[PDB]
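Anyone have tokens for CT263? Sequence:
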Amino acid sequence: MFKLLLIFADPAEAARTLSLFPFSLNKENFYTYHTENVLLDVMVLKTWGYRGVVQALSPPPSGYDLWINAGFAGAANPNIPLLKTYTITSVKELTPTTSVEEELEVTPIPRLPLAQLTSVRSPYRDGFHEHLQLVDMEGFFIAKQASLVACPCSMIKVSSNYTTREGQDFLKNNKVKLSQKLAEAIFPIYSSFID
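Reply: yep, here.
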């Protein structure tokens, strides 16, 4: 039986994927669906409060065959169009006060175009950057937790806004369309593992 964990950072990201399958909430308080040889579980990292906490994925869930982190990502290069779905080749955590970075490779999903992801605690609204492509908050954390259980991790990131002050309104106003893009990327993957 193939065991797939989908990880969303927040309910807006998860919303349309949760509509795709008839999930139920289990006694452990997260969504699950199974059919044929495939178990599909969904975790949402931040349902409460102003920030996510480390204990959302710590200890990391063991026993899955693949993790997919699907989420929104800001675009920090104007040659990235919005509402476009990418898969990630590597993800960098960046700490702006020291410039220290760490970086991990992630497993690209077939058929999706490639991008690099940078994860930061505070969303960029500085403007555009020569060195950055997509920017999120939780990608690196998820990839590193996946390594603790030796589980492959893939990322799907949809470009949700440009990383500017004026750019934030587009994210505010398009969460359903953006979530739907994630759902449309997850479905063919789910279908590939039907034996």
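The domain at 1-195 is CATH 3.40.50.1580 (Rossmann fold).
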